[PDB]
Structure formats: C-alpha cells, structure tokens
C-alpha cells in the first residue's frame, strides 16, 4: 500500500483538461515537503514533469498545485502523446524516504469492436501429445475486453491463459488467449469456442475436431 | 548527462544480482543517485539512494537488509546489489540522478534506461514452433514453451511485412512463455506463394524456419 | 533550480522545523552543517515520534545547505559531528532532557535563519 494515493485511471478526449490527484498525510505532502510529478510513456523510463509542487524543468500544458495534504497535476489541451502513467513523489518524514504514489494511467480516448480469429490445435502439436486452441483479438478500442471459453457450450476455466490488452502500432489494442488441452480432451468434444466481449458486443469464434 | 545501466539478467530464487549505473559526462559524485524498482503492472517503488562523494547510502524500510547501494567515484558508477532473490523481485530497476547537486528535494531529472531482472526457477529452453494453417486468409505460427524472453519472428526472412501481427507472449502456468505471430494474405496466393516464419530465440541460440502450408 | 529558490526553501524548512519544535511544547555553512550533524547525533539517542521526525528534517536541511555550498564554489564534506559514551555527557552539563535539546536546536536554527539572510561564508 503506497503512502501516496492516486486514481487508478483517468480518461479524457483530445483538447480536454485532466486532473490527477495525490493525497497523503501530514508527514509527507503536509508539513512543507513538496510533491513531484513524473511521466512514464509506454516502454520508457520516467521523466520529471513537475518538481517542487509547481515548477517545470516541459510544455506549459502541464501544471501543478498543492493544498493541504493534497497535490494535483493539470494537463490542459490533452494530446495523444500525453497518454501515459503519471507518478507523484514526496518525502515521507515518518519513514524517511522519497516514496512514490500508486500512479495514474492517463488514457486519451473512437470505439471499435474486436476482430477475433480462432486457430485449432496443430496436427504436429497433437503428435507432440499437446493441444492448444488460440484466440487472437485485434483492432479494438478501448482496451477493456473479456474472454470466455466453452466446450460444447459448457464454460471452461481450467487451462486458460489470457493477456491484458496491449497497444498496437495503430494506437488500438490486441490480445491473445490460449486453451491448453490434451489431444484426447480436444477430440472428446465436438466444438470449442472463444467469446470476446467488448462494450456489450460479443464476437464468438468456434472450431471443431 | 546520461546514466547507462547494465544488461538484463535472469536469476534463480536464492541467488543475488548486481546492477550498475555508469555516468556519461557529469560530476557523478556531487549528485545523488536513487534506485527505484518497478514490477510489471505496478508503479515505481523508491528502494534507496546514495551520494557518492559522502559515501553513505539510504534504504527504504521495505528493502532494508537485502539491498546494498554503493558508488565508485573513480569510474563514476553506482551499484545496487540485491540478495536472496524471490519471485516478487522480478522487475525493472532504474537508477536516477537528482536535479540539483546533493538532494532529492527537487526531484530526479536524469533517469536510466532500466535493467530488467527476472527471478524464476525456469531454465533456458528453445521454442517449439507449430503452424497455424489458413477475400483474405490468415496464417501464422505458434512459438510455444520457451524461456526466457524474448523471441523475434520474421516472415519470408523479412520480405513480408504487410499484414503481420506478432502478439505479446503469455507466461503459462509452467513458467515458460508462448507467443503467436499471424499474417493476413490474399486467398488466391496460398497456391503459389510460400510463407515461412523465422523464429529466433537468442537466449537458447535457436532459430526455426517453419513453413505454414494450407 | 535557481540558488535563490534554494535559499527560499532552506529558510522555509527552517521555519517549519522551528514551528514544529514550538508545537512539541553558527556562521559559515560548514559550522551550520557541523551543528546540525551534532544535533542529529543527539536526537538519535532520544527517539520519539517528533524527535525522529526532526532528525529527518535536519537531514534534508543539511542536504539543502550543501546545495548552497556547492552553488558557492566551495566544498565542505559531510561533517562527522562528534568525536565520541554519550549518556554521560548528555546527562551532565549537556542535553538529554528532550525539551532542553529541542530548545537549543530551535535557537541554533533561529540563528542560522539570520545568518543565511546575510549571505554567509562557506
């Protein structure tokens, strides 16, 4: 449990003002000690956005303020490049250390339902006494996506491995799910299906031995 | 100024690791060097710091007893050694130089690239490459049961780039990774053209050229 | 960061520490660093909530003092503090009494305030 608290996620459309908060107690944000803000873009090292509550090393679109036991980072005129994790840092005087916050994932927002593709187990894989059904989801925004498996209509929950939606090169999302079976299990049913739910719309794909 | 870090490392539980942080043009000793870890999907965790010229380091209570932060002013290189590695230590470790000389009061303005340290009892192993047979058709390859990351996937040795998607790997319950790489092609070309996936796993020094036929 | 802002934040931290000492109830930069090191060593021997907090605050204040010193193109390493049995000296004709220690520290900080306003030596 981080000493400093932040919203897990905030979202806004381009050109909107977004505010990320950072709250603590009198031993950190209160009692004089300042609050820094760092930006971390997907797959990169943190960069210093704000130091000493308000100062900038950074576009003027980013700004900071501090009141009581809270601090806040304001991003005016949200751009596509600001989509990233934001961490607030402050010195805790009870623990003696510059500790960070939980971080806030800032998302810049057009909906798009997913394209699903289901591959059955390979003949070679079955000859390796292994079976893997592959459900690949791609071209869906936002990231939220649920994956469920069914064999002959009954839910399958054992042997399911799914990923958290990752960002594509087109600023959208993709994901992958795997159902691991033995050749006999795969042959013992008549159909397997993966169902991908996204913003209330579900795409179902089925394969048969 | 730039801070350059050592390469990624894979270790087993119980062992130890030592990450470096060399300077690239700065009064390394006058500044403060902080070590911050970040696990996958978690946030930054301040592990500690050290001012080399003074020689004394400071450690977060969490990592106290298992982390040692040292500095070599001659080579202008900081070191962070973590012993008794657990599964939870799997993370990227950053070193960061403070903005003003000897204080964190004003933040840390020069961060490093990060060093990935992976703690798992799994051992190096190459992948098993199986074919995912196909107005558009989709073919692909399944790169199953390999360790550690990463593998790279090309098609026709790099001549095919249109319509390729190499998805992120998944950490199976067995400790090994699995990846899928698909590509969409004209349905009419399956009879004439040859599609081959070239999978490269440098940790195990394996390379597999597998043809995906209908 | 401008050295002006470093001076401002050092004075502000000093005022914060002075008011905190209230709530519980030298000249050059090198001598200030030495005084704060000695007070840190004293406060470490009588650990409470506010005393640990004041010692950490003094660590930050020393860091800021050294920022200033380095901005003035002059080195003054981390002052050791004492030469070092604490209990004896502390009890007799010394400190030990937590209130007495915190009051002496408040006075030293108040003197450092004026001295820093005077752009002191190194």
Author numbering:
A (entry chain B): 1 to 57, 60 to 111, 114 to 213
B (entry chain A): 2 to 135, 143 to 222
C (entry chain C): 1 to 25, 48 to 106, 109 to 146
What do the authors say?
Leptin, a hormone primarily secreted by adipocytes, regulates energy balance and systemic metabolism through its interaction with the leptin receptor (LEPR). Here, we report the x-ray crystal structures of a leptin-neutralizing antibody (hLep3) in the unbound and leptin-bound states.
The interaction of this antibody with leptin mimics the interaction of the LEPR with leptin, providing direct insights into the mechanism by which the antibody disrupts leptin signaling. Leptin helices A and C and the residues from the loop between helices C and D contribute to all the interactions with the heavy and light chains of the neutralizing antibody. In the Fab:leptin complex, residues of leptin helix A interact with residues from both the Fab light chain (Asn26, Ala31, Gly32, Tyr33, His34, Tyr51, and Arg95) and the Fab heavy chain (Gln100, Val101, Tyr106, and Tyr107). Key interactions include a hydrogen bond between the Fab heavy chain Tyr107 and leptin Asp9 and a salt bridge between the Fab light chain His34 and leptin Asp9. Similarly, leptin helix C engages with residues from the Fab heavy chain (Ser31, Ile52, Phe55, Val101, Pro102, Ser103, Ser104, Tyr106, and Tyr107) and Fab light chain (Tyr33, Arg95, Gly98, and Glu100). Crucial interactions include hydrogen bonds between Fab light chain Tyr33 and leptin Asp79 and between Fab light chain Arg95 and leptin Asn78. Two residues from leptin’s C-D loop (Pro99 and Glu100) further stabilize the Fab heavy chain interaction. The LEPR CRH2 domain forms more hydrogen bonds with leptin than the Fab does (five versus three), yet the Fab epitope involves a broader region, including leptin’s helix C and residues from the C-D loop. The observed epitope overlaps between the Fab:leptin and LEPR CRH2:leptin complexes offer valuable insights into the antibody’s mechanism of action. The resolution of the Fab:leptin complex revealed that electrostatic interactions, shape complementarity, and minor conformational changes contribute to antigen binding.
